[PDB]
Amino acid sequence: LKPEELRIDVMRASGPGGPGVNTTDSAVRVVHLPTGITVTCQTTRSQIKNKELALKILKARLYELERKKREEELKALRGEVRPIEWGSQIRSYVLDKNYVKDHRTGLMRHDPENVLDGDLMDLIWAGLEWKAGRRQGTEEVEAE
Amino acid sequence: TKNGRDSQAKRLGVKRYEGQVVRAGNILVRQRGTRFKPGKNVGMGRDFTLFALVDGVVEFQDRGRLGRYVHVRPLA
Amino acid sequence: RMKYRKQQRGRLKGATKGGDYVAFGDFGLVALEPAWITAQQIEAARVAMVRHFRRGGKIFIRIFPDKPYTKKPLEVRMGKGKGNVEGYVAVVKPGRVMFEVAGVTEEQAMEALRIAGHKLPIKTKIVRRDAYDE
RNA sequence: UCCCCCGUGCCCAUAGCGGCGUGGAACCACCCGUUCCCAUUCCGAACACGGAAGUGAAACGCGCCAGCGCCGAUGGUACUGGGCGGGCGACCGCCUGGGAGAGUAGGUCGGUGCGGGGG
RNA sequence: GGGCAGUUUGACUGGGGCGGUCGCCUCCUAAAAGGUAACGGAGGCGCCCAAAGGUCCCCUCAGGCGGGACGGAAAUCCGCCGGAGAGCGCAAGGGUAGAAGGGGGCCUGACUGCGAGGCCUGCAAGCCGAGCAGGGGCGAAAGCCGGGCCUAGUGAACCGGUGGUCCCGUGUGGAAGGGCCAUCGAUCAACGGAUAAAAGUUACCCCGGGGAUAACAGGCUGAUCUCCCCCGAGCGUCCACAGCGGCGGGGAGGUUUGGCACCUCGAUGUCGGCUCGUCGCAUCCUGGGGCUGAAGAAGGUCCCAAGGGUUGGGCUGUUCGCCCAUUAAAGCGGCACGCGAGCUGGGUUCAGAACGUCGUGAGACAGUUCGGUCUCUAUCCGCCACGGGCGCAGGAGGCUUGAGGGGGGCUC
RNA sequence: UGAACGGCGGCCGUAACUAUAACGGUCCUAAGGUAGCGAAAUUCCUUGUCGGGUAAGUUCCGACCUGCACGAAAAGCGUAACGACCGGAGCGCUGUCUCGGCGAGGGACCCGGUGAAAUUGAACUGGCCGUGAAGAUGCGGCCUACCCGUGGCAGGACGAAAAGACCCCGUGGAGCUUUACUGCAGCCUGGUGUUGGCUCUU
RNA sequence: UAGCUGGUUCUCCCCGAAAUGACUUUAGGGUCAGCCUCAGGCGCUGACUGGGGCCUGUAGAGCACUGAUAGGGCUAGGGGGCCCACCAGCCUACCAAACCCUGUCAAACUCCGAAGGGUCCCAGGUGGAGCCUGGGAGUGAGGGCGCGAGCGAUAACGUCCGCGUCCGAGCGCGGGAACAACCGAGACCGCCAGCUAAGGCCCCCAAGUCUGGGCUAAGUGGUAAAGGAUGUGGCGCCGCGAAGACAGCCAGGAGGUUGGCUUAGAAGCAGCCAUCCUUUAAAGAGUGCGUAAUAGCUCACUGGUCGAGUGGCGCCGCGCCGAAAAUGA
RNA sequence: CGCGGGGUGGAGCAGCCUGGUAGCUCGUCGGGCUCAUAACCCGAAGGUCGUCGGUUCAAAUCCGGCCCCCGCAACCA
RNA sequence: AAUGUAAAAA
Ligand SMILES: [Mg+2]
Ligand SMILES: [Mg+2]
Ligand SMILES: [Mg+2]
Ligand SMILES: [Mg+2]
Ligand SMILES: [Mg+2]
Ligand SMILES: [Mg+2]
Ligand SMILES: [Mg+2]
Ligand SMILES: [Mg+2]
Ligand SMILES: [Mg+2]
Ligand SMILES: [Mg+2]
Ligand SMILES: [Mg+2]
Ligand SMILES: [Mg+2]
Ligand SMILES: [Mg+2]
Ligand SMILES: [Mg+2]
Ligand SMILES: [Mg+2]
Ligand SMILES: [Mg+2]
Ligand SMILES: [Mg+2]
Ligand SMILES: [Mg+2]
Ligand SMILES: [Mg+2]
Ligand SMILES: [Mg+2]
Ligand SMILES: [Mg+2]
Ligand SMILES: [Mg+2]
Ligand SMILES: [Mg+2]
Ligand SMILES: [Mg+2]
Ligand SMILES: [Mg+2]
Ligand SMILES: [Mg+2]
Ligand SMILES: [Mg+2]
Ligand SMILES: [Mg+2]
Ligand SMILES: [Mg+2]
Ligand SMILES: [Mg+2]
Ligand SMILES: [Mg+2]
Ligand SMILES: [Mg+2]
Ligand SMILES: [Mg+2]
Ligand SMILES: [Mg+2]
Ligand SMILES: [Mg+2]
Ligand SMILES: [Mg+2]
Ligand SMILES: [Mg+2]
Ligand SMILES: [Mg+2]
Ligand SMILES: [Mg+2]
Ligand SMILES: [Mg+2]
Ligand SMILES: [Mg+2]
Ligand SMILES: [Mg+2]
Ligand SMILES: [Mg+2]
Ligand SMILES: [Mg+2]
Ligand SMILES: [Mg+2]
Ligand SMILES: [Mg+2]
Ligand SMILES: [Mg+2]
Ligand SMILES: [Mg+2]
Ligand SMILES: [Mg+2]
Ligand SMILES: [Mg+2]
Ligand SMILES: [Mg+2]
Ligand SMILES: [Mg+2]
Ligand SMILES: [Mg+2]
Ligand SMILES: [Mg+2]
Ligand SMILES: [Mg+2]
Ligand SMILES: [Mg+2]
Ligand SMILES: [Mg+2]
Ligand SMILES: [Mg+2]
Ligand SMILES: [Mg+2]
Ligand SMILES: [Mg+2]
Ligand SMILES: [Mg+2]
Ligand SMILES: [Mg+2]
Ligand SMILES: [Mg+2]
Ligand SMILES: [Mg+2]
Ligand SMILES: [Mg+2]
Ligand SMILES: [Mg+2]
Ligand SMILES: [Mg+2]
Ligand SMILES: [Mg+2]
Ligand SMILES: [Mg+2]
Ligand SMILES: [Mg+2]
Ligand SMILES: [Mg+2]
Ligand SMILES: [Mg+2]
Ligand SMILES: [Mg+2]
Ligand SMILES: [Mg+2]
Ligand SMILES: [Mg+2]
Ligand SMILES: [Mg+2]
Ligand SMILES: [Mg+2]
Ligand SMILES: [Mg+2]
Ligand SMILES: [Mg+2]
Ligand SMILES: [Mg+2]
Ligand SMILES: [Mg+2]
Ligand SMILES: [Mg+2]
Ligand SMILES: [Mg+2]
Ligand SMILES: [Mg+2]
Ligand SMILES: [Mg+2]
Ligand SMILES: [Mg+2]
Ligand SMILES: [Mg+2]
Ligand SMILES: [Mg+2]
Ligand SMILES: [Mg+2]
Ligand SMILES: [Mg+2]
Ligand SMILES: [Mg+2]
Ligand SMILES: [Mg+2]
Ligand SMILES: [Mg+2]
Ligand SMILES: [Mg+2]
Ligand SMILES: [Mg+2]
Ligand SMILES: [Mg+2]
Ligand SMILES: [Mg+2]
Ligand SMILES: [Mg+2]
Ligand SMILES: [Mg+2]
Ligand SMILES: [Mg+2]
Ligand SMILES: [Mg+2]
Ligand SMILES: [Mg+2]
Ligand SMILES: [Mg+2]
Ligand SMILES: [Mg+2]
Ligand SMILES: [Mg+2]
Ligand SMILES: [Mg+2]
Ligand SMILES: [Mg+2]
Ligand SMILES: [Mg+2]
Ligand SMILES: [Mg+2]
Ligand SMILES: [Mg+2]
Ligand SMILES: [Mg+2]
Ligand SMILES: [Mg+2]
Ligand SMILES: [Mg+2]
Ligand SMILES: [Mg+2]
Ligand SMILES: [Mg+2]
Ligand SMILES: [Mg+2]
Ligand SMILES: [Mg+2]
Ligand SMILES: [Mg+2]
Ligand SMILES: [Mg+2]
Ligand SMILES: [Mg+2]
Ligand SMILES: [Mg+2]
Ligand SMILES: [Mg+2]
Ligand SMILES: [Mg+2]
Ligand SMILES: [Mg+2]
Ligand SMILES: [Mg+2]
Ligand SMILES: [Mg+2]
Ligand SMILES: [Mg+2]
Ligand SMILES: [Mg+2]
Ligand SMILES: [Mg+2]
Ligand SMILES: [Mg+2]
Ligand SMILES: [Mg+2]
Ligand SMILES: [Mg+2]
Ligand SMILES: [Mg+2]
Ligand SMILES: [Mg+2]
Ligand SMILES: [Mg+2]
Ligand SMILES: [Mg+2]
Ligand SMILES: [Mg+2]
Ligand SMILES: [Mg+2]
Ligand SMILES: [Mg+2]
Ligand SMILES: [Mg+2]
Ligand SMILES: [Mg+2]
Ligand SMILES: [Mg+2]
Ligand SMILES: [Mg+2]
Ligand SMILES: [Mg+2]
Ligand SMILES: [Mg+2]
Ligand SMILES: [Mg+2]
Ligand SMILES: [Mg+2]
Ligand SMILES: [Mg+2]
Ligand SMILES: [Mg+2]
Ligand SMILES: [Mg+2]
Ligand SMILES: [Mg+2]
Ligand SMILES: [Mg+2]
Ligand SMILES: [Mg+2]
Ligand SMILES: [Mg+2]
Ligand SMILES: [Mg+2]
Ligand SMILES: [Mg+2]
Ligand SMILES: [Mg+2]
Ligand SMILES: [Mg+2]
Ligand SMILES: [Mg+2]
Ligand SMILES: [Mg+2]
Ligand SMILES: [Mg+2]
Ligand SMILES: [Mg+2]
Ligand SMILES: [Mg+2]
Ligand SMILES: [Mg+2]
Ligand SMILES: [Mg+2]
Ligand SMILES: [Mg+2]
Ligand SMILES: [Mg+2]
Ligand SMILES: [Mg+2]
Ligand SMILES: [Mg+2]
Ligand SMILES: [Mg+2]
Ligand SMILES: [Mg+2]
Ligand SMILES: [Mg+2]
Ligand SMILES: [Mg+2]
Ligand SMILES: [Mg+2]
Ligand SMILES: [Mg+2]
Ligand SMILES: [Mg+2]
Ligand SMILES: [Mg+2]
Ligand SMILES: [Mg+2]
Ligand SMILES: [Mg+2]
Ligand SMILES: [Mg+2]
Ligand SMILES: [Mg+2]
Ligand SMILES: [Mg+2]
Ligand SMILES: [Mg+2]
Ligand SMILES: [Mg+2]
Ligand SMILES: [Mg+2]
Ligand SMILES: [Mg+2]
Ligand SMILES: [Mg+2]
Ligand SMILES: [Mg+2]
Ligand SMILES: [Mg+2]
Ligand SMILES: [Mg+2]
Ligand SMILES: [Mg+2]
Ligand SMILES: [Mg+2]
Ligand SMILES: [Mg+2]
Ligand SMILES: [Mg+2]
Ligand SMILES: [Mg+2]
Ligand SMILES: [Mg+2]
Ligand SMILES: [Mg+2]
Ligand SMILES: [Mg+2]
Ligand SMILES: [Mg+2]
Ligand SMILES: [Mg+2]
Ligand SMILES: [Mg+2]
Ligand SMILES: [Mg+2]
Ligand SMILES: [Mg+2]
Ligand SMILES: [Mg+2]
Ligand SMILES: [Mg+2]
Ligand SMILES: [Mg+2]
Ligand SMILES: [Mg+2]
Ligand SMILES: [Mg+2]
Ligand SMILES: [Mg+2]
Ligand SMILES: [Mg+2]
Ligand SMILES: [Mg+2]
Ligand SMILES: [Mg+2]
Ligand SMILES: [Mg+2]
Ligand SMILES: [Mg+2]
Ligand SMILES: [Mg+2]
Ligand SMILES: [Mg+2]
Ligand SMILES: [Mg+2]
Ligand SMILES: [Mg+2]
Ligand SMILES: [Mg+2]
Ligand SMILES: [Mg+2]
Ligand SMILES: [Mg+2]
Ligand SMILES: [Mg+2]
Ligand SMILES: [Mg+2]
Ligand SMILES: [Mg+2]
Ligand SMILES: [Mg+2]
Ligand SMILES: [Mg+2]
Ligand SMILES: [Mg+2]
Ligand SMILES: [Mg+2]
Ligand SMILES: [Mg+2]
Ligand SMILES: [Mg+2]
Ligand SMILES: [Mg+2]
Ligand SMILES: [Mg+2]
Ligand SMILES: [Mg+2]
Ligand SMILES: [Mg+2]
Ligand SMILES: [Mg+2]
Ligand SMILES: [Mg+2]
Ligand SMILES: [Mg+2]
Ligand SMILES: [Mg+2]
Ligand SMILES: [Mg+2]
Ligand SMILES: [Mg+2]
Ligand SMILES: [Mg+2]
Ligand SMILES: [Mg+2]
Ligand SMILES: [Mg+2]
Ligand SMILES: [Mg+2]
Ligand SMILES: [Mg+2]
Ligand SMILES: [Mg+2]
Ligand SMILES: [Mg+2]
Ligand SMILES: [Mg+2]
Ligand SMILES: [Mg+2]
Ligand SMILES: [Mg+2]
Ligand SMILES: [Mg+2]
Ligand SMILES: [Mg+2]
Ligand SMILES: [Mg+2]
Ligand SMILES: [Mg+2]
Ligand SMILES: [Mg+2]
Ligand SMILES: [Mg+2]
Ligand SMILES: [Mg+2]
Ligand SMILES: [Mg+2]
Ligand SMILES: [Mg+2]
Ligand SMILES: [Mg+2]
Ligand SMILES: [Mg+2]
Ligand SMILES: [Mg+2]
Ligand SMILES: [Mg+2]
Ligand SMILES: [Mg+2]
Ligand SMILES: [Mg+2]
Ligand SMILES: [Mg+2]
Ligand SMILES: [Mg+2]
Ligand SMILES: [Mg+2]
Ligand SMILES: [Mg+2]
Ligand SMILES: [Mg+2]
């Protein structure tokens, strides 16, 4: 809500008042120039209390406009998909035959019982971070 | 705005300055406390009022650590 | 802070006590006109001062806002001002020393104080520590 | 007329706090005792009576010291009855009469009145 | 028991209503006597106590440091410093230990009958009071006591209650009923208190007044609003001013919103539109420039410059604004927000009616909705035109000079 | 006892992404607004959002529902026909408009006859810039201006008209209202008069 | 009925208000007081003034109380770090009670404290003074100006008090262009006489184009600020200079060095930290520009020439910019 | 801005007026019955009383400023 | 006096 951005307008009010309403402009129109979103107010006899209210109103809407854009840049980072369905998985942990398996690196293993306890290092270190940065490190150094 | 208040002015202070002739019984000084102590030929009432005790002349005496005093030097 | 409530305006009579001498630092900035100096003023000067000579010497401020400055909010005539919109100011009679600097070259303190002057409403003077003491 | 002491006033710190010293013949105090008068929300600490011995340690008396406290000019200034003069003002300047506070120089461990005992 | 009737329904108030306030005490404002206003700054009272009173006698605080079984910053004890920063029932102030403060013995003067002389004061009230008489309390006595350290703790008169006595008692004796003395019934708190007894509504409204007082406009003011400057943190890769300018500071203007209440209430017609304009320049375009982070074309920024120009539609009563299609550009302000004795009357702002809403209600609404009478004759100034008179120091016909004005002024 | 006056909730939590919340917790009530409708003759924010129509639509129509502040006989939702009712659109047609022109007649104008009115302190009544009770023909300074009329225009004379209706004041007035006060009519009611006989009964 | 509006008729003479306080279903009305006037009475007292006594808490100042306050010191408490646990120890460019030093602020703070004011005594003061008792009143919306405060915004022709004062009622006279209250001055009547006051003395317009010494070049004067500038004149101070300066011009202007560190690069030149020497007459581990980083230009400094003054800073007078409005100046 | 109300264990409410000890329901935690979960039974824990000041021997409680939430009001021209 | 999902018959 920097004063440099929005323009404020003054104009006589619609409705009752006497000569006071005709000759005294108390209505206000506070348009936000960049975002284009405008707002008008005139519920009180005063220009300042309308100029004041019309601003607290614009604040609410501009907060709800910043929360919408605050979503794509804090939710698109989560995952561009993730069905959670079947096959949407990237690493299976089979306790019957005792074998985990990262479907990304194709890497395999033989201890689901310990891995599900802390042995993630062996996975993240060598293979995981590798393929993770690989799919993006081969994308930039070729075409993207 | 709760504030538009005060109480009556009590018009106190010295009522008879030094040298002034006085009739017995008439008042010399009205005061908040004992801003003046009685002394010779001068009595004091419930409110700390000092009043001459016999026709005479008022005179004031300062006695430092012991405070100021009002006296009536008689004559007749 | 503490004190109590809001306070009468009074008047900025002759600069009787509105005078002084340096007592800290080598250089000083003295007032030449009577005025209520705002906190926003004192500060803006002080900051703009250090801001000038980064990690520089040490500045002293001998004037201090204790007076509540009131202000009715765009209306008519009831009660005393809710006031304090400008909050607090310091009384300054022409001649009083306000800001001391120390531990910097003359040209380094001839600028620092030159600036702090501008952030102030009144006309001011810069001073060497002459030689007048007690 | 002089000196010491006892009691009691007057001004109201230049009379006070503190450190050092001196006084027991006289006076004063502590001091011996608690039968009697009297007394303790307990206690002869206090109040009280009867009083030798000892002491001047305590208290007080006198005298020295200026660390604290207190007193504190002169000179100039702020302010200001009254009278004027300059600027938009927040303000400022002169004539005439009065004149601080702070601070500097200094001062002070008192001065005196009545009665009484004693050289 | 509003079917009906007579009435009540407070004042202050930078207009009125709404809110707040109304008496009393303390402090400041108050300008060194007293007094002193504002819807100026701050707080209390509408009680309490038979001990918290009288007198006689005795005792002296808070706090700090040190030492002490519970204690633990703080209970009670001891020591040293400590003049009053404690306490004085309760707000504050003044006063105060050479007691007004803490404790104890006896006690009830929180007496009756008075009252010299004063303080304060418009009235009426309020306050202080020596001493005299009676009969008393404490003290050996001198003496002290007519409540409380003091300043708030309150209510004229009327009307009535209870108790008592030298009073009156309607021909006389009693009685009734009064008087006098004593005391009781006040948030009469709008607190000098109209009645024993009282709320609203009007846009269906009326009269008397007011520019003593609000709504329009002008005025003063310039907070607010618009424009412009000072400083130069920082941005701009390098470069603080090509373009920008944190935190602060100084001004101009009188288009906004306010403040004030100065002319007008025996009337200054309020918005918008239409018509007709004219002026300002802080310039939208066109004309001329400086800088550019200006190759050119095009821009950006500042300077000079009113001479002319500055479109047509959609939506809404709109001003404003959004939008469509163009343009050299589609400038901003003044003129009573120019202009209703020029027009309109869609909006506001009478009576009808309805919705939501509030109110038991009558009604009410910067809430909404449909409807709703705008006055032939210009005297003067001014303005557009057109004549009559006289003058122009012979009379007449025709032709002329241009002092001084006016018109025009655009752009692709 | 409601087709009598009337009334008809609040806070927090919960879903195979997020959002929402069919579900739940709790407090309170006499009971917590059902159907149907809903930015409405009701919606403040508001020109709500989306769709329609238009080159462009604060209006209009269709939707959605976070209904400031609908809602069921002060009726709810619909409804053919009807309407000098109020809103939106289109076709036809047009001087409504671009944008005005010409023409006719009745006035206006000139001559003859008759002959009013409101208004009116008195007038020998110019412009600007100041000024003054703050908007000047009348004051100051300056500019301008021969005397008198006729046809026209309406910026001024704070023009005329109506002792402002708006506002406030007055211990003014009146109409209306009620659980304001006090009365009255009216209606209810005990005693008694008009009012008598016989019998049972406590 | 009208606490409201309007209206109220001949002359001369003397005096001459108020717009405040208290209470008021009072607020544009009233009652009492204040102020005006008339009558009778008292008779030096009255305003103002001299001398003396007492009462006082403002201006100013001050920090001793109540609070506020910047820096430093000393130092409980708490916080971080070393170290740890039995709790103990030290460090502490963190915050900070008490205390102290330096430096300050306060209407509701005062160790202090004026000028002044109040009152009484004595004296001057015979004045449209004063006091006592009465008859008659009006006024009870004030306004501006100076000064002292509150409110407001250290706004208002604003508002509310205090001491004055003028208008009111002196819109009678002079000055101020015009203009109740600013400056001068209190109009009984007449004069073709004189001196003055404020203000003025070039023309409208009376009176000096007076005298002497300066300043100002803007039409300033003829009405505006922060702030900006080689405007102009004046006093003062420091320094350079005939042993040769200032300015311009001829020449060098460097070596290790390319300073250590940051950084893609930082070579005197984004920033951070900074204190060598030497060829020598002189050149700074560097004033500005130029770069991607450098080289290039220049000052600083020294040599020569010239040949007489020159540069910085403080102070005062007057002036310049800052400076845009609507009917004609 | 004006007047009125409110802020207390994780959720929602008492307690305050008349100061001395903070209560109710839900959820949470431990233990039970069940094959297991829920229901149900037995235990237990949990609160700066919004915040900053003031009164008092003592403050959730009374007084005052502030922040936050709720409702009402914002009219005449 | 409720509930118990989703991968097993040469
Ligand atoms: Mg910007
Ligand atoms: Mg509208
Ligand atoms: Mg209305
Ligand atoms: Mg209206
Ligand atoms: Mg207006
Ligand atoms: Mg206006
Ligand atoms: Mg008051
Ligand atoms: Mg004293
Ligand atoms: Mg007495
Ligand atoms: Mg500091
Ligand atoms: Mg108002
Ligand atoms: Mg408040
Ligand atoms: Mg001898
Ligand atoms: Mg020793
Ligand atoms: Mg002994
Ligand atoms: Mg015995
Ligand atoms: Mg005996
Ligand atoms: Mg005995
Ligand atoms: Mg004895
Ligand atoms: Mg010894
Ligand atoms: Mg001793
Ligand atoms: Mg010696
Ligand atoms: Mg000494
Ligand atoms: Mg002196
Ligand atoms: Mg000025
Ligand atoms: Mg001034
Ligand atoms: Mg003198
Ligand atoms: Mg002195
Ligand atoms: Mg001494
Ligand atoms: Mg002596
Ligand atoms: Mg009844
Ligand atoms: Mg009735
Ligand atoms: Mg007003
Ligand atoms: Mg009002
Ligand atoms: Mg009203
Ligand atoms: Mg009211
Ligand atoms: Mg008052
Ligand atoms: Mg109270
Ligand atoms: Mg007592
Ligand atoms: Mg004792
Ligand atoms: Mg302590
Ligand atoms: Mg201790
Ligand atoms: Mg101990
Ligand atoms: Mg101890
Ligand atoms: Mg111990
Ligand atoms: Mg124990
Ligand atoms: Mg403890
Ligand atoms: Mg201890
Ligand atoms: Mg002890
Ligand atoms: Mg000891
Ligand atoms: Mg003392
Ligand atoms: Mg003290
Ligand atoms: Mg006490
Ligand atoms: Mg007390
Ligand atoms: Mg006191
Ligand atoms: Mg004493
Ligand atoms: Mg006692
Ligand atoms: Mg006692
Ligand atoms: Mg006792
Ligand atoms: Mg007597
Ligand atoms: Mg008397
Ligand atoms: Mg009286
Ligand atoms: Mg009277
Ligand atoms: Mg007596
Ligand atoms: Mg007797
Ligand atoms: Mg007595
Ligand atoms: Mg007492
Ligand atoms: Mg007593
Ligand atoms: Mg007592
Ligand atoms: Mg008193
Ligand atoms: Mg009566
Ligand atoms: Mg008798
Ligand atoms: Mg009889
Ligand atoms: Mg008998
Ligand atoms: Mg009697
Ligand atoms: Mg009441
Ligand atoms: Mg009253
Ligand atoms: Mg009453
Ligand atoms: Mg009456
Ligand atoms: Mg009554
Ligand atoms: Mg009444
Ligand atoms: Mg009707
Ligand atoms: Mg009527
Ligand atoms: Mg008037
Ligand atoms: Mg009035
Ligand atoms: Mg108008
Ligand atoms: Mg006007
Ligand atoms: Mg400017
Ligand atoms: Mg930036
Ligand atoms: Mg940069
Ligand atoms: Mg300014
Ligand atoms: Mg204007
Ligand atoms: Mg205005
Ligand atoms: Mg007026
Ligand atoms: Mg007025
Ligand atoms: Mg008229
Ligand atoms: Mg008229
Ligand atoms: Mg109009
Ligand atoms: Mg109009
Ligand atoms: Mg151009
Ligand atoms: Mg070009
Ligand atoms: Mg180019
Ligand atoms: Mg380029
Ligand atoms: Mg280019
Ligand atoms: Mg081209
Ligand atoms: Mg130029
Ligand atoms: Mg220009
Ligand atoms: Mg257009
Ligand atoms: Mg377009
Ligand atoms: Mg074009
Ligand atoms: Mg364009
Ligand atoms: Mg265009
Ligand atoms: Mg403009
Ligand atoms: Mg125009
Ligand atoms: Mg108009
Ligand atoms: Mg205007
Ligand atoms: Mg208009
Ligand atoms: Mg009309
Ligand atoms: Mg119109
Ligand atoms: Mg008309
Ligand atoms: Mg019509
Ligand atoms: Mg229209
Ligand atoms: Mg309409
Ligand atoms: Mg209307
Ligand atoms: Mg009407
Ligand atoms: Mg109607
Ligand atoms: Mg409206
Ligand atoms: Mg309509
Ligand atoms: Mg007609
Ligand atoms: Mg005329
Ligand atoms: Mg004219
Ligand atoms: Mg010509
Ligand atoms: Mg021409
Ligand atoms: Mg022309
Ligand atoms: Mg032209
Ligand atoms: Mg039913
Ligand atoms: Mg209902
Ligand atoms: Mg409802
Ligand atoms: Mg979910
Ligand atoms: Mg039920
Ligand atoms: Mg509903
Ligand atoms: Mg619909
Ligand atoms: Mg709508
Ligand atoms: Mg709509
Ligand atoms: Mg509304
Ligand atoms: Mg709407
Ligand atoms: Mg609307
Ligand atoms: Mg829309
Ligand atoms: Mg869309
Ligand atoms: Mg459209
Ligand atoms: Mg559309
Ligand atoms: Mg449509
Ligand atoms: Mg909805
Ligand atoms: Mg919705
Ligand atoms: Mg809703
Ligand atoms: Mg809303
Ligand atoms: Mg509403
Ligand atoms: Mg609704
Ligand atoms: Mg409803
Ligand atoms: Mg119904
Ligand atoms: Mg329907
Ligand atoms: Mg139909
Ligand atoms: Mg019909
Ligand atoms: Mg019809
Ligand atoms: Mg058609
Ligand atoms: Mg047209
Ligand atoms: Mg014709
Ligand atoms: Mg005719
Ligand atoms: Mg005809
Ligand atoms: Mg004719
Ligand atoms: Mg003429
Ligand atoms: Mg002009
Ligand atoms: Mg005038
Ligand atoms: Mg005049
Ligand atoms: Mg005129
Ligand atoms: Mg004249
Ligand atoms: Mg004229
Ligand atoms: Mg002319
Ligand atoms: Mg004619
Ligand atoms: Mg005509
Ligand atoms: Mg006209
Ligand atoms: Mg006409
Ligand atoms: Mg007219
Ligand atoms: Mg009238
Ligand atoms: Mg009344
Ligand atoms: Mg009846
Ligand atoms: Mg009957
Ligand atoms: Mg009957
Ligand atoms: Mg009967
Ligand atoms: Mg019968
Ligand atoms: Mg006379
Ligand atoms: Mg006279
Ligand atoms: Mg009246
Ligand atoms: Mg009178
Ligand atoms: Mg005399
Ligand atoms: Mg004093
Ligand atoms: Mg002072
Ligand atoms: Mg001392
Ligand atoms: Mg203190
Ligand atoms: Mg204290
Ligand atoms: Mg240390
Ligand atoms: Mg510690
Ligand atoms: Mg430890
Ligand atoms: Mg420890
Ligand atoms: Mg340590
Ligand atoms: Mg003071
Ligand atoms: Mg005081
Ligand atoms: Mg003085
Ligand atoms: Mg005097
Ligand atoms: Mg004579
Ligand atoms: Mg006279
Ligand atoms: Mg006289
Ligand atoms: Mg006399
Ligand atoms: Mg008289
Ligand atoms: Mg009278
Ligand atoms: Mg009156
Ligand atoms: Mg008045
Ligand atoms: Mg005056
Ligand atoms: Mg002045
Ligand atoms: Mg005021
Ligand atoms: Mg001031
Ligand atoms: Mg003024
Ligand atoms: Mg008058
Ligand atoms: Mg006079
Ligand atoms: Mg005049
Ligand atoms: Mg003239
Ligand atoms: Mg004048
Ligand atoms: Mg005149
Ligand atoms: Mg005059
Ligand atoms: Mg003079
Ligand atoms: Mg002249
Ligand atoms: Mg100027
Ligand atoms: Mg100026
Ligand atoms: Mg100037
Ligand atoms: Mg200047
Ligand atoms: Mg420059
Ligand atoms: Mg040199
Ligand atoms: Mg030589
Ligand atoms: Mg040069
Ligand atoms: Mg050369
Ligand atoms: Mg060279
Ligand atoms: Mg060269
Ligand atoms: Mg070289
Ligand atoms: Mg060189
Ligand atoms: Mg070179
Ligand atoms: Mg180097
Ligand atoms: Mg180089
Ligand atoms: Mg080169
Ligand atoms: Mg200078
Ligand atoms: Mg100067
Ligand atoms: Mg210019
Ligand atoms: Mg003009
Ligand atoms: Mg909670
Ligand atoms: Mg309780
Ligand atoms: Mg109970
Ligand atoms: Mg449970
Ligand atoms: Mg469990
Ligand atoms: Mg269990
Ligand atoms: Mg158990
Ligand atoms: Mg447990
Ligand atoms: Mg609390
Ligand atoms: Mg909340
Ligand atoms: Mg909320
Ligand atoms: Mg509301
Ligand atoms: Mg209202
Ligand atoms: Mg309204
Ligand atoms: Mg109304
Ligand atoms: Mg109304
Ligand atoms: Mg009305
Ligand atoms: Mg098979």
XYZ file of C-alpha atoms (C1' of nucleotides) in Angstrom, chain E residues 60-66 73-76 78-83 85-87:
20
model
C 9.369 7.723 69.104
C 9.308 6.361 62.837
C 10.455 4.578 57.774
C 14.783 2.788 56.049
C 20.046 0.925 55.614
C 24.141 -2.349 57.291
C 25.879 -6.431 60.609
C 13.734 -9.775 50.047
C 10.079 -9.102 54.327
C 7.464 -12.190 60.981
C 10.386 -11.843 66.200
C 20.417 -7.655 69.436
C 23.925 -3.857 67.761
C 25.477 0.647 64.843
C 23.817 4.867 61.450
C 19.150 7.449 60.636
C 15.283 15.090 61.878
C 11.620 10.340 53.281
C 7.001 6.789 58.726
C 2.598 7.502 60.975
